[PDB]
Structure 1
Amino acid sequence: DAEFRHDSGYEVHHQKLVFFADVGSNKGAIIGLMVGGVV
């Protein structure tokens, strides 16, 4: 079985994840990235 057939001439995968990029001032409770969390 062909679970996955990748046919291409060039595969480019790029991922960018920037959290809290340039902040004037963080007061109290601040979350730049919350995943399945709780406060």
Structure 2
Amino acid sequence: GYEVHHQKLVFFAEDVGSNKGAIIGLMVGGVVIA
């Protein structure tokens, strides 16, 4: 009697342009110097 479907997970749906910095979807630990 269990049913799971059509989940959805997005990080950056739209466009990413002319980036000159640091774009990170998921970070664990770690250092960022933008």
Task: Give me the TM-score of the superposition, normalised by structure 1.
Answer: 0.29
Higher Cα radius of gyration: 1
**Over 3 Å off, 4+ runs:** none
Between the aligned residues of both structures, percent identity stands at: 100
Tell me the C-alpha RMSD between the 2 structures.
2.7
The secondary structure found in structure 1 opposite 2:16 is: coil
Segments of 5+ residues of structure 1 without an aligned counterpart are 1-8
Instruction: Report the Cα offset of residue 14 of structure 1.
Output: 4.4
**Unpaired runs of at least 5, structure 2:** none
What is the TM-score of this pair, normalised by structure 2? 0.29
